[PDB]
Design an enzyme around this catalytic site. Structure first.
Site, PDB file in Angstrom:
ATOM      1  N   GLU A 127     -23.160  17.229 -66.963  1.00  9.77           N
ATOM      2  CA  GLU A 127     -23.679  16.074 -66.165  1.00  9.77           C
ATOM      3  C   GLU A 127     -22.474  15.103 -65.592  1.00  9.77           C
ATOM      4  O   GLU A 127     -21.439  15.049 -66.294  1.00  9.77           O
ATOM      5  CB  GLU A 127     -24.429  14.995 -66.934  1.00  9.77           C
ATOM      6  N   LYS A 173     -33.014  12.862 -62.863  1.00 10.61           N
ATOM      7  CA  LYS A 173     -33.092  12.214 -64.356  1.00 10.61           C
ATOM      8  C   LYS A 173     -34.218  11.152 -64.395  1.00 10.61           C
ATOM      9  O   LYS A 173     -33.995  10.131 -63.573  1.00 10.61           O
ATOM     10  CB  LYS A 173     -31.843  11.837 -64.583  1.00 10.61           C
ATOM     11  N   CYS A 221     -29.056  14.499 -70.586  1.00 11.21           N
ATOM     12  CA  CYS A 221     -28.488  13.421 -71.296  1.00 11.21           C
ATOM     13  C   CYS A 221     -29.449  12.602 -72.167  1.00 11.21           C
ATOM     14  O   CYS A 221     -30.113  13.311 -72.911  1.00 11.21           O
ATOM     15  CB  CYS A 221     -27.507  12.557 -70.391  1.00 11.21           C
TER      16      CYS A 221
HETATM   17  C1  LIG Z   1     -25.279   8.103 -78.873  1.00  9.08           C
HETATM   18  C2  LIG Z   1     -25.892   8.009 -77.407  1.00  9.08           C
HETATM   19  N1  LIG Z   1     -25.042   8.308 -76.588  1.00  9.08           N
HETATM   20  C3  LIG Z   1     -25.182   8.290 -75.080  1.00  9.08           C
HETATM   21  N2  LIG Z   1     -26.241   8.057 -74.518  1.00  9.08           N
HETATM   22  C4  LIG Z   1     -26.394   8.061 -73.189  1.00  9.08           C
HETATM   23  C5  LIG Z   1     -25.681   8.318 -72.426  1.00  9.08           C
HETATM   24  C6  LIG Z   1     -26.055   8.450 -70.985  1.00  9.08           C
HETATM   25  O1  LIG Z   1     -27.139   8.698 -70.561  1.00  9.08           O
HETATM   26  N3  LIG Z   1     -25.090   8.528 -70.096  1.00  9.08           N
HETATM   27  C7  LIG Z   1     -25.422   8.708 -68.621  1.00  9.08           C
HETATM   28  C8  LIG Z   1     -24.210   8.736 -67.800  1.00  9.08           C
HETATM   29  C9  LIG Z   1     -23.157   7.940 -68.585  1.00  9.08           C
HETATM   30  C10 LIG Z   1     -23.158   6.427 -68.507  1.00  9.08           C
HETATM   31  C11 LIG Z   1     -22.095   5.498 -68.950  1.00  9.08           C
HETATM   32  O2  LIG Z   1     -20.818   5.913 -68.879  1.00  9.08           O
HETATM   33  C12 LIG Z   1     -20.666   7.292 -69.152  1.00  9.08           C
HETATM   34  C13 LIG Z   1     -21.591   8.411 -68.576  1.00  9.08           C
HETATM   35  C14 LIG Z   1     -23.653   8.023 -70.017  1.00  9.08           C
HETATM   36  C15 LIG Z   1     -24.259   8.872 -72.823  1.00  9.08           C
HETATM   37  N4  LIG Z   1     -24.229   8.773 -74.264  1.00  9.08           N
HETATM   38  C16 LIG Z   1     -26.469   6.595 -77.100  1.00  9.08           C
HETATM   39  C17 LIG Z   1     -27.799   6.092 -77.237  1.00  9.08           C
HETATM   40  N5  LIG Z   1     -28.013   4.875 -76.926  1.00  9.08           N
HETATM   41  C18 LIG Z   1     -27.116   3.743 -76.889  1.00  9.08           C
HETATM   42  C19 LIG Z   1     -25.724   4.318 -76.817  1.00  9.08           C
HETATM   43  N6  LIG Z   1     -25.363   5.582 -77.125  1.00  9.08           N
END
Ligand SMILES: C[C@H](Nc1ncc(C(=O)N2CCC3(CCOCC3)C2)cn1)c1cnccn1
Ligand SMILES: *[C@@H]1O[C@H](CO)[C@@H](O[C@@H]2O[C@H](CO)[C@@H](O[C@@H]3O[C@H](CO[C@@H]4O[C@H](CO)[C@@H](O)[C@H](O[C@@H]5O[C@H](CO)[C@@H](O)[C@H](O)[C@@H]5O)[C@@H]4O)[C@@H](O)[C@H](O[C@@H]4O[C@H](CO)[C@@H](O)[C@H](O)[C@@H]4O)[C@@H]3O)[C@H](O)[C@H]2NC(C)=O)[C@H](O)[C@H]1NC(C)=O
Ligand SMILES: *[C@@H]1O[C@H](CO)[C@@H](O[C@@H]2O[C@H](CO)[C@@H](O[C@@H]3O[C@H](CO)[C@@H](O)[C@H](O)[C@@H]3O)[C@H](O)[C@H]2NC(C)=O)[C@H](O)[C@H]1NC(C)=O
Ligand SMILES: *[C@@H]1O[C@H](CO)[C@@H](O)[C@H](O)[C@H]1NC(C)=O
Ligand SMILES: *[C@@H]1O[C@H](CO)[C@@H](O)[C@H](O)[C@H]1NC(C)=O
EC number: 3.5.1.92
Length: 461
Positions: A57, A156, A189
């Site tokens: 992604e 998404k 994701c």
């Molecule tokens: C362990 C889990 N990790 C997680 N969750 C979600 C996303 C995610 O969807 N991304 C989409 C694009 C992204 C936007 C932020 O900058 C980087 C790129 C990360 C990425 N890592 C988590 C769940 N709840 C809270 C915090 N962390």
């Protein structure tokens, strides 16, 4: 029937960023710098016999955007029913250079290509759901078959905190594509933590395999990419191809190829700045029939331990009720609200200055996302100090000859996690019983970081 699966972990070239939005030409040049690298992985995978390759992604343009800065990177991605090979008819839908290249990559290498790009859907002030911007912008997975044809487009559903550059579709898109090597489902994701479309693809659409572009930020002890994504594939009884961004500075690392029985290939690296291509064979139509009742055993038995010293511990901002494990062998039971966790264990030897605890959690997660959890965890406390149980611990020295974990889960969606030092998976050193017990089949190949039953109660979100 079997097939060769490929995933590529990508060290992306991010845009210089930001202030004023770049021109289409500047946007395209960056995207082509990323595509040149993905071209390398697609061609090698294809030369090594892979039938499909998943790329991560945000692999083409990164993640630092607002609505206006994102716009020059976007293409209008048509509906896959339109029957189009962008490599053979380059200008059918106007200016679409990224779709054209992805189509050519899949066609020239005779391989299915799964990538994540951005979709633009212009709208008028007429429809009330149209943004004042004049368009919808979506985080979109595209799938090109071995002939270069667009066979899937997925917007998404579950956006993360601060993903303000994108829109959410009104209805969840349940996107599937069928092949000679199984039925495939797709999601992205954060979608892996929700019901729609993730659970629906598996339980209602009966897909054999999930393709998963991800840009995952690792959160120990339960939400490290390799760990949770392989647990979800095992809990959902499906093949799973996880392709992640490589960015150690943001804790982004962990790609793999997972089968319902166990992991088949995995990659974790916090040291280098390099990408990695993974390949592995899989069954086209694995068995999905091995059903588990997650509360069966645990609701039949009586508490294994009595009047024990219990303490509150924080795990990813969630307050778990813990019970320290005293002795090289034991039987403990710990409860929090409607959830009772049971553990039976025997360590390979008691290692000095290394504390393990059994934790129960029954509640709603709220920090950077709202979702309801029921968790039973055997975890390595970061230090000997009990107030450190549930903190992110990357190494351990205690191997286990045996373990048996279970819980009174009020859900059928429980993901079995086994994580070793240092963020290494344990295939197939463990199994799940029809009774809902996560148990070892041999002494662990390495020291244990955690053995967890991660449950989701989607209805309480
Ligand atoms: C362990 C889990 N990790 C997680 N969750 C979600 C996303 C995610 O969807 N991304 C989409 C694009 C992204 C936007 C932020 O900058 C980087 C790129 C990360 C990425 N890592 C988590 C769940 N709840 C809270 C915090 N962390
Ligand atoms: C996605 O694509 C897949 C793959 O093309 C589609 O699935 C196919 O659907 C066909 C139509 O329903 C099925 O055809 C019938 O097959 C049976 C024979 O049984 C099969 O024997 C095969 C050879 O050994 C084997 O591949 C197959 O699959 C397996 O099924 C078992 C369970 O039994 C399971 O354990 C495996 O995992 C695997 O799935 C079966 O065992 C024929 O008897 C049948 O009869 C014929 O009807 C024809 C008309 O349709 C007619 O031409 C003929 O005269 C007979 O009357 C069909 O030929 C095919 O099995 C099936 N393939 C697979 C691998 O599933 C799927 O439908 C698509 N999905 C979507 C949503 O589009
Ligand atoms: C998984 O295993 C558990 C344990 O057998 C199943 O849960 C149990 O479901 C039965 C219904 O068949 C519940 O019985 C009910 O008990 C209450 C009184 O306590 C009352 O409403 C009735 O007398 C009724 O018989 C039982 O309590 C319940 N147990 C628990 C702990 O939830 C579960 O449904 C099984 N699922 C599958 C699909 O196998
Ligand atoms: C694919 O092949 C066609 C001709 O066979 C060529 O024009 C095109 O540049 C190629 N694209 C890629 C990215 O390999
Ligand atoms: C744990 O329970 C099992 C089964 O009852 C038993 O065989 C084992 O000896 C117990 N171990 C300890 C140390 O309590």
């Amino acid at each position: 029937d079997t097939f060769t699966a490929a995933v590529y972990e990508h060290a992306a070239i991010l845009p210089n960023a930001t202030l004023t939005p770049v021109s289409r030409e500047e946007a395209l040049a960056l995207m082509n710098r990323n595509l040149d690298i993905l071209e390398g992985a697609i061609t090698s995978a294809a030369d090594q016999g892979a039938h499909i390759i998943v790329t991560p992604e945000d692999a083409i343009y990164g993640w630092n955007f607002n609505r206006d800065s994102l716009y020059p990177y976007l293409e209008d991605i048509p509906d896959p029913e339109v029957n189009w090979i962008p490599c053979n008819n380059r200008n059918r839908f106007g200016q679409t250079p990224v779709q054209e290249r992805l189509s050519c990559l899949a066609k020239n290498n005779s391989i299915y290509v799964v990538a994540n790009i951005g979709d633009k859907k212009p709208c008028d002030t007429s429809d009330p759901q149209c943004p004042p911007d004049g368009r919808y912008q979506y985080n979109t997975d595209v799938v090109f078959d071995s002939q270069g044809k667009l066979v899937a487009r997925y917007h998404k559903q579950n956006l993360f905190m601060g993903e303000n550059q994108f829109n959410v579709p009104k209805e969840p898109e349940i996107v599937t594509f069928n092949t000679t090597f199984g039925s495939f489902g797709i999601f992205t994701c954060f979608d892996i933590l929700f019901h729609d479309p993730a659970v629906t693809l598996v339980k209602d659409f009966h897909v054999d395999t999930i393709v998963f572009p991800t840009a995952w930020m690792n959160v120990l002890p339960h939400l490290s990419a390799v760990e949770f994504h392989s647990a979800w594939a095992m809990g959902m009884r499906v093949n799973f191809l996880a392709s992640n961004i490589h960015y150690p500075s943001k804790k982004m690392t962990g790609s793999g190829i997972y089968a319902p029985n166990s992991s088949r290939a995995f990659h974790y690296d916090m040291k280098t700045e390099e990408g990695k291509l993974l390949l592995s064979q899989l069954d086209s139509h694995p068995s999905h029939s091995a059903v588990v009742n997650w509360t069966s055993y645990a609701s039949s038995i009586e508490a294994l331990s009595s009047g024990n010293k219990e303490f509150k511990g924080t795990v990813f901002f969630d307050e778990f009720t813990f019970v320290k494990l005293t002795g090289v062998a034991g039987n403990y039971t710990v409860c929090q609200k409607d959830l009772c966790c049971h553990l039976s264990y025997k360590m390979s030897e008691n290692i000095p200055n290394e504390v393990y605890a059994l934790g129960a959690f029954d509640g709603l997660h709220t920090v950077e996302g709202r979702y309801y959890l029921q968790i039973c965890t055997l975890l390595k406390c970061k230090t000997t100090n009990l107030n450190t149980c549930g903190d992110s611990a990357e190494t351990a020295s205690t191997r286990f000859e045996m373990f048996s974990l279970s819980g009174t889960f009020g859900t059928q969606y429980v993901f079995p996690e086994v994580l070793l030092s240092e963020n290494q998976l344990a295939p197939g050193e463990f199994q799940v019983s029809t009774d809902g017990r996560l148990f070892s089949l041999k002494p662990t190949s390495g020291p244990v970081l955690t053995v967890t039953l991660f449950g989701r109660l989607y209805e309480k979100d």
